[PDB]
């Protein structure tokens, strides 16, 4: 029964700017994730990325729009030793009613894990209602009021 | 007050084969562990300062504006993550301008060598080059050429937090 973080993208690792990091210059990084997260890979908590992209792939968000930011973002984390298991992305808009958009479960169905000891960490309502939807623990991601460090140090 | 003198290029970040410019984003990419080992040496005491020789930043063979996004994102990363640079020093010379600024040369950091400024016995450079090394000597201080196999950000974590 391994432990798992379930990690939110967009306002949690990264800032969140139209909501969508498309071009390098939206890309900054949230404060003290790379050093938590490390100490929490060291607690030995698996790390699993999951992201709402809406629209990824259409004429307001292109696919390699997303890419270049996402990808220094990943050669970023990956060459501080910070590694995510999987990244699972939900590319669709709202208005799609997909089966794979946050809060719904069918990204993460797999692991459906020590749930007494697992987390959604996120910064939306969403997020929260991801980690119910999961029955584990949710973390409400906030820069100022439940970040990083508060994260890192709780968890170990 | 101990200080690492830290080259940007090749040290902190890889330097491009071609032009040896990191003129473009997909041109960006960080050492292997860099981040947490500068926290481990600030956390052991050490203040840190970049030093960079930027060859024609800031005309149309390096255009500030090129040079700016990349590095602006670097520090923004550094910043984020707690590691904080006192200063960035940059040379932005061509080698033919015969500079006073550029490494080896000590003009950018002539504030350091005034008498009681820095513990010279337990302050280095670190660079990947031979500029870097001579910097050193000039100074009065130790280098560590950084080299990506032999020595590298976690072992120079490692020497340089010995006791
Ligand atoms: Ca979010
Ligand atoms: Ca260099
Ligand atoms: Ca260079
Ligand atoms: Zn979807
Ligand atoms: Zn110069």
């Given at each position: 029964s391994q432990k798992y973080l379930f990690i939110?993208?967009?306002?949690?690792?990264?800032?969140?700017?139209?909501f969508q990091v498309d071009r390098f210059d939206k890309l900054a990084f949230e404060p003290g994730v790379i050093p938590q997260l490390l100490k929490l890979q060291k607690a030995g908590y698996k790390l699993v990325m999951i992201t709402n992209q809406d629209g990824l792939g259409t004429q307001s968000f292109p696919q390699a729009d997303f890419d270049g930011p996402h990808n220094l973002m990943m050669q970023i984390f990956?060459?501080?030793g910070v590694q995510f298991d999987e990244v699972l992305i939900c590319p669709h808009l709202p208005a799609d009613?997909?089966?794979?958009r946050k809060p719904k479960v069918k990204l993460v169905e797999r692991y459906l894990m020590d749930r007494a000891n697992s987390?959604?960490?996120?910064?939306?309502?969403?997020?929260?209602?991801?980690?119910?939807?999961?029955?584990?623990?949710?973390?409400?991601?906030?820069?100022?009021?439940?970040?990083?460090?508060?994260?890192?140090?709780?968890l170990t």
């Amino acid at each position: 029964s391994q432990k798992y973080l379930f990690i939110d993208r967009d306002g949690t690792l990264i800032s969140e700017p139209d909501f969508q990091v498309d071009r390098f210059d939206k890309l900054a990084f949230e404060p003290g994730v790379i050093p938590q997260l490390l100490k929490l890979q060291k607690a030995g908590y698996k790390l699993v990325m999951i992201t709402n992209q809406d629209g990824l792939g259409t004429q307001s968000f292109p696919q390699a729009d997303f890419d270049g930011p996402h990808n220094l973002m990943m050669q970023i984390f990956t060459s501080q030793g910070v590694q995510f298991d999987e990244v699972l992305i939900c590319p669709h808009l709202p208005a799609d009613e997909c089966d794979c958009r946050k809060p719904k479960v069918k990204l993460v169905e797999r692991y459906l894990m020590d749930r007494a000891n697992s987390y959604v960490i996120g910064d939306r309502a969403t997020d929260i209602q991801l980690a119910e939807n999961m029955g584990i623990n949710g973390l409400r991601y906030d820069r100022e009021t439940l970040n990083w460090p508060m994260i890192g140090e709780q968890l170990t």
